[PDB]
Amino acid sequence: MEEIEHRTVEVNGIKMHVAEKGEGPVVLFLHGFPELWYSWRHQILALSSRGYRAVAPDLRGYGDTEAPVSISSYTGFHIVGDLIALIDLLGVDQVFLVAHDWGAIIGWYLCTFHPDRVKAYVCLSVPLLHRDPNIRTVDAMRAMYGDDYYICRFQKPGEMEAQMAEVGTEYVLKNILTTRKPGPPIFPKGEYGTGFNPDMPNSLPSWLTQDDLAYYVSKYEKTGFTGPLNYYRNMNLNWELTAPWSGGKIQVPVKFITGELDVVYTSLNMKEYIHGGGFKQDVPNLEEVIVQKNVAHFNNQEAAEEINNHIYDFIKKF
C-alpha cells in the first residue's frame, strides 16, 4: 500500500489512474463492477514480492480515471483501446493478464483482438461470453429472466442511478459487496430496495474491513455509478460490433477461477457452459477450471491467498 506507486497517464485520449508496484514481467490487473484498482490490493502486494510488475489501473469511468460523458464511449473497443495504449507505455510486447467481473469481459476482448499481446490469462468469475448469432446479449437475458433482471434494469439511462441514490452510495456498495446469495439477481419493480442482498449482515464479513468499504464509498460518492453502469449499456452494441469474430476461437492459455456461490456461476446456464463443453470448445487452451467452495463473487478479496498462489503457479509455466 505505502509503496504502491500511483500516477496518471494519458492513454487513448483519456487520463487514467494507474497503480503499480514491483519489477519483472507485467501482471496487468483488470477489476470489475462496482470496484476499483483497490480490489487487487492483496494480489498487488503478493505478486509484487515474487518478481513481477503488478499493474492495476482504474478503468475508464472508475475511480480517479477520467469518465467520458457519453454512453457510447464505453464499448469494449474503447476500453481495450485504453489498455493497448497502457501496455505500450509500460514498454513490453506481452503481458500476464489477470481479470475479474467486467474487467474479465474486457480481458476476453483483449485476448480476442490481440492474442499476441497476452502470454497467459487468469480469468476470475466471468468466462468467455459466447457470441450467439441468433440473439443479442441483453435480448437473451431479458428472454430468460424478464425485465427486472439486474442487467436489463441497468440499461435505461439515469434510472438505476436515481434508485441507487435513494438508498445511498454506502448501502449499495455494502449491499453488493456482502452478497452471498446465488442465482440471477432480480430487482423489485421501480426501486433498488434490497437489490442484490435481501440478507445484509450487521457486521462486514472478515475479508472486508470498515476502512476498505470507506475507500470504495469515498470514490463512488464522488464519481457516481454512471461510468461503470455504461459498460452494461453497451452489451448489445458490443455484440453487434463483434460480428467479425462470430464463431471464433481464443487460443490464449487461460486459468478460470470462480467462487461456488458467485451469481455469475449460478445463472445464465453458465455452469453448463463452463463444465459441459462449450467453454473448452471456444477456448482450446483453457486449463484447469477451479471452483472455490463457500466463496462468492468477490473471490480475489475473499480467497486472496488461494488466488495469489493460483496466479503464480499458472504464470510460471510460461
Catalytic annotation present for 192 = no
Categorise residue 50: left if φ over 0, alpha if ψ from -120 to 50, beta otherwise: alpha
Distance CA 144, CA 268 (A): 8
Give me the phi and psi of 255, to 5 degrees please.
Answer: -115, 115
Helix (H, G, I), strand (E, B) or coil at 117: helix
239: nearest Cα among 166, 133, 164: 133
Cell of 32: 470489475
Side chain identity, residue 167: V
Question: What distance in Å separates the CA atoms of residue 299 and residue 207, rounded to the nearest whole number?
Answer: 10
User: Is 228:260 a contact under the CB 8 Å cutoff?
Assistant: no
Question: Which of 74, 145, 232, 265 is the catalytic position?
Answer: 232
Does an H or E element contain 291, and which?
A: strand 290-292
Reduce the DSSP state of residue 247 to 3 states and report it: coil
Task: Tell me, letter by letter, the H, E, C secondary structure of 178-236.
Answer: CCCCCCCCECCCCCCCCCCCCCCCCCCCCCCCHHHHHHHHHHHHHHCCHHHHHHHCCHH
Residue 232 annotated among the catalytic residues of the structure: yes
Out of 58, 101, 262, 282, the active site residue is 101
Choosing from 17, 78, 100, 297, the catalytic residue is 297
Q: Would residue 275 show up in a list of annotated catalytic residues for this protein? A: no
Instruction: Give the catalytic positions in this structure.
Output: 101, 232, 297
